[PDB]
Ligand binder design. Structure first.
Ligand SMILES: Nc1ncnc2c1ncn2[C@@H]1O[C@H](COP(=O)(O)O)[C@@H](O)[C@H]1O
Ligand SMILES: Nc1ncnc2c1ncn2[C@@H]1O[C@H](COP(=O)(O)O)[C@@H](O)[C@H]1O
Ligand SMILES: Nc1ncnc2c1ncn2[C@@H]1O[C@H](COP(=O)(O)O)[C@@H](O)[C@H]1O
Ligand SMILES: Nc1ncnc2c1ncn2[C@@H]1O[C@H](COP(=O)(O)O)[C@@H](O)[C@H]1O
Ligand SMILES: O=P(O)(O)OC[C@@H]1O[C@H](COP(=O)(O)O)[C@@H](O)[C@@H]1O
Ligand SMILES: O=P(O)(O)OC[C@@H]1O[C@H](COP(=O)(O)O)[C@@H](O)[C@@H]1O
Ligand SMILES: O=P(O)(O)OC[C@@H]1O[C@H](COP(=O)(O)O)[C@@H](O)[C@@H]1O
Ligand SMILES: O=P(O)(O)OC[C@@H]1O[C@H](COP(=O)(O)O)[C@@H](O)[C@@H]1O
Ligand SMILES: [Mn+2]
Ligand SMILES: [Mn+2]
Ligand SMILES: [Mn+2]
Ligand SMILES: [Mn+2]
Ligand SMILES: [Mn+2]
Ligand SMILES: [Mn+2]
Ligand SMILES: [Mn+2]
Ligand SMILES: [Mn+2]
Lengths: 317, 317, 317, 317
């Protein structure tokens, strides 16, 4: 009585009486992620080193061809491509897929955890697909999730029904459901932010950080953690509780994280897990995108920690 | 032409005119690390999940068994064991090995990078082997290094002639030399410390951090990173540059990090790479331990960043 | 534009407007075969050998639990169980599955190729499932096939539409379609039989063998091949052409190979591939089984080679 | 406690007081075999099938490159190369290696067991290294063995002190000693020969086969097996007992099997295991080659079965 991703996706496609198109899509994603995982852990590297006489780019190509080979997509948006990819009408399905094929690429030389992030929208409208089809607020997401290539490979999938975590068994190449209907803690004890940007923080963030290090009610201070790869930082937030933040600063008054393929999927996982995701002023899932590579400030995590900071944001409002 | 860890170790052992006792020890280590890597990556997990027919305890058991069978060790010191382990006379060799089988174990549920740390001493006072044989300053290390299980598995080996990084190709189970004679940048641009302890930092540390966030000469502040796993943080330092800190505070008046199997091996690596590793008052390698599970304050990284901090310490002295 | 077993099975389930039950079944089989393949190639053997301090039986259990976990089966027949396994009504589906979890087990110590063989029937009737549900002639098979664990792992799947071959990529744990709509050669140049039973052969087999070694029309003689594992011998027959035979002798006047889980699936693959499978008197697929472990003589392969021998069988009739 | 090929080789090399030159050669071989095994098992095939972003030539290239880099060889002899390969003086060592990189290559499309065969000689006449250095009788082998890629990968190594089998654990890329000091049964019960050449067999062979099918003393006839891959057939002989035959016929008046890299290594293995290996007229190891691609008749296996056949030869002499 074990549950594999392949079994789960099919039973769910059956319960929802789908035509099987989304199921074929989710299966192609599962296959793409296993292929990326393998290249990340460097299997075959000996060949590059002459035993017999890129990564971001390879990841992009894998995700694109595998997704197109699903016959379930019409518009693809990648962090790696300036323009949205419109699918050939022969393989054109009804899904729009926004993804970051390998987030944290600059961490690669340091062997820090990296991941793949994706959000799926159903093409709403009836005209020649285009970038406009991806410009939907995150509230319209059919599914969203990410794959984390850390000490082990994990796929976290969020859909209307909830959040589920699947661990990859690289021996048989199968994702096994290990955490079902996940819920984030109401209050965590870790905060995550790049404090090297201190001089740039708005007063509300500055005050919050101060409350965490020197608690006014004399409670224990929060521990700090900042891996430097969103997928790793968010996954730790989801599993262990706490708050993650990447607010605005000189690096764009608009934030650094991209709305469509970084913030939205994460905000979606967070909300389905019972947490919050806000820009400080509004909920991330409610922002109407105007540009496929639009950035946005984001704060996510345990609801009590996010509301606490939202209050400070009010006090300074 | 390609260089595997197996060939390199043997070659070095040949140039050193060794009896091949250390070579066997190093081959054993390599075998232990590949085994731990496989377990960490979760191969075979489908079995726990009943496709019908603890990770730090297994790691401990693997290291101890694999090292004993090398017939090259007489005294073992593990983070996991209260007392030193004395090898049976039948299996005795002349080496003392101090290791942390799986560091960052708390981080396991969050899939954060973890690693194995080891330091190798040669038994000097030839009395019956005992705990006192491990009580040697790090300046007496013959070899030290670590294995990091991150996006990929890497083994860094440092010996008197320098530091070398080997990447694991899991397809053929062989470590390939990917970086020769490593040297750390003179000055970095990332500082790594758990700022959650700000309330308890000594003055020098407090001044240094603030200097990194608000540099006097209005230059770019240092970026910040803190994975919360020493091997991961120390490996990013060695490779990318910067400074790593785990100073003395209240919950740990002498630091959290253990001297024999965490601070020494890492300080040795740092020093052979041209970096510094201090306690704030003194070099970590010169400290003569008195207890095998002794703790010690540690600051390591690019020579200029560490020097700058040490000047500040002297200033408050 | 690559085709994985998972994609293929789903598109075919869609074309046939299935409810998705057979598809879930085929997916469970694919997963069982990858798990068996891994144990066959001995991954993890170091643990049996004490690195940190059956096969036929393990294969049976994997296939049974994985199949039951599909919720698509009601009656399971295994070469390893005296009695047919009736599925719990909770997980009871509509399919009857006959399989040999690991054929050629006595070859294991010699590392000869071995495999898994399976035939699927739709439960015809409407009463409490039982052994009687498996007692159908092979002509009623919905699907049949085998997995060969040889130099590489291959899954050959035969359905009403034809025969397809999928090679396993153990790096990503995915079967890739490599040979589509396979057809056996009309005439081969290799014959396969255990000639150690010469003294026991009926006159027709004896004459045929004689024609192959000393051709009366002076054509080149046929080469001989006899691996000793049916799956290996049949797979070579399917791919390279020729004839395979295991007629009756003192080892049962009834043959050695079992009808339900060895002969039928193979006869089915053969026929779908355009070849023949006969007992010498009748077509194997047409025999009405009377006992789940019933044996039967079998001759299969290229149609011209099988008809040639059938003629000799007539001459001696 | 467990024994890996790496430890065993080093230990043996220590007991022999070698300079570690042969040890490096043997470590190189091991690395080459693991690499070939991975390629044979088809890892990464999904790439040829365009998940978008010859096996005997690659094997040849792997062996040659990996052996050259060992700095232990001066002359290489491959089944795949017309002339011997002379290693650059910069990389010269004292050993001559004769190998078949991938034997049974015809069998690849049929997924039949294949293997690698090697024999190691020490350069004696110290003139400029040349082809003549490989022209040594097998009685002069320092080491020989083979790697079989069957249901699992095994490496059999024979040296003056005996024959040892190592099983590859692909999870950690390590060969584990699974069988120590192997010895073949005195008498077997399987004979292995391509009976398709019956029309061309000499009288002795013809009598022997018939004696196996119809034993005078009405005892059980020998079972027959003929995989068609020497390593597979010879490995079943060593492990299970019996006799393997590839006599002289018409299409091959001196046999098909080559002396230097097929017959010698296998005869050496057989002899250290307590078996016999003859040409019919003489022991294979005593033959002094005159051409590097020379062919030779071979009969090997249990000492009693081979003797019996040799008596029959003498009878027709
Ligand atoms: N595997 C599945 N899991 C959960 N919901 C599904 C699945 N397949 C389809 N659905 C749902 O049913 C809708 C239509 O399915 P489809 O016909 O495949 O496009 C989807 O957009 C989801 O809302
Ligand atoms: N593989 C090696 N790599 C580097 N140094 C070595 C190696 N083998 C031996 N040496 C050195 O030679 C000394 C004696 O080696 P041993 O006789 O094997 O105990 C060691 O303690 C090292 O200092
Ligand atoms: N994956 C599939 N491939 C080919 N035929 C299928 C598939 N699924 C179902 N069918 C066919 O449709 C019938 C009923 O499907 P099902 O509703 O799943 O039981 C099967 O028995 C086959 O005859
Ligand atoms: N690893 C080993 N295993 C068995 N015998 C060895 C080993 N190493 C060296 N010897 C033997 O010692 C001789 C010289 O070794 P070498 O100096 O390395 O060239 C060889 O030719 C073998 O006869
Ligand atoms: O390189 P990417 O693909 O844009 O992602 C890097 C991002 O960079 C953030 C960290 O940025 P700072 O270095 O500015 O903190 C992470 O949280 C995200 O992973
Ligand atoms: O779980 P361990 O073996 O004690 O290791 C955790 C150690 O803990 C340090 C961080 O601890 P803090 O949470 O106190 O910062 C790391 O740098 C070391 O990896
Ligand atoms: O051991 P199993 O599972 O019954 O299968 C062995 C069978 O045995 C046949 C060979 O039998 P002989 O040794 O009698 O030739 C093969 O063709 C089949 O694989
Ligand atoms: O393809 P190769 O390298 O020539 O090897 C085939 C050889 O051929 C022999 C069998 O050949 P026949 O078909 O003539 O029996 C085997 O025993 C050897 O493995
Ligand atoms: Mn990216
Ligand atoms: Mn990104
Ligand atoms: Mn530990
Ligand atoms: Mn530790
Ligand atoms: Mn069986
Ligand atoms: Mn069987
Ligand atoms: Mn060859
Ligand atoms: Mn050959």
């Amino acid at each position: 009585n074990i549950v594999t991703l392949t079994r789960f996706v099919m039973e769910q496609g059956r319960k929802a009486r789908g035509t099987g198109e989304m199921t074929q899509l989710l299966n192609s994603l599962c296959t793409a992620v296993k292929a990326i995982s393998t290249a990340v852990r460097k299997a075959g590297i000996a060949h590059l080193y002459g035993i017999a006489g890129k990564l971001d780019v390879l990841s992009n190509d894998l995700v694109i061809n595998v997704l197109k080979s699903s016959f379930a997509t019409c518009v693809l948006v990648t962090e790696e491509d300036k323009n949205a990819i419109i699918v050939e009408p022969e393989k054109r399905g009804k899904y729009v897929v926004c993804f970051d094929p390998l987030d944290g690429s600059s961490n690669i030389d340091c062997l820090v955890s990296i991941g793949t992030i994706f959000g799926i929208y159903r093409k709403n409208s009836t005209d020649e697909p285009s970038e406009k089809d991806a410009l939907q607020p995150g509230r319209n997401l059919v599914a969203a999730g990410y794959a984390l290539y850390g000490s082990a490979t994990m796929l976290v999938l969020a859909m209307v029904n909830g959040v589920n975590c699947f661990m990859l068994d690289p021996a048989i190449g199968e994702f096994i459901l290990v955490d079902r209907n996940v819920k984030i803690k109401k209050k965590g004890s870790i905060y995550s932010i790049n404090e090297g940007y201190a001089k740039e923080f708005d007063p509300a963030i500055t005050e919050y950080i101060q409350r965490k290090k020197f608690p006014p009610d004399n409670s224990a201070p929060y521990g700090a953690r900042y891996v430097g790869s969103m997928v790793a930082d968010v996954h730790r937030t989801l599993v262990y509780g706490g708050i993650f933040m990447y607010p605005a600063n000189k690096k764009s008054p608009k934030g650094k994280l991209r709305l469509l393929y970084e913030c939205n999927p994460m905000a979606y996982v967070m909300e389905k897990a019972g947490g919050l995701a806000t820009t400080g002023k509004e909920a991330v899932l409610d922002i109407v995108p105007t540009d496929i590579h639009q950035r946005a400030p984001i704060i996510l995590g345990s609801p009590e920690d996010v509301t606490e900071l939202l209050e400070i944001y009010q006090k300074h409002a």
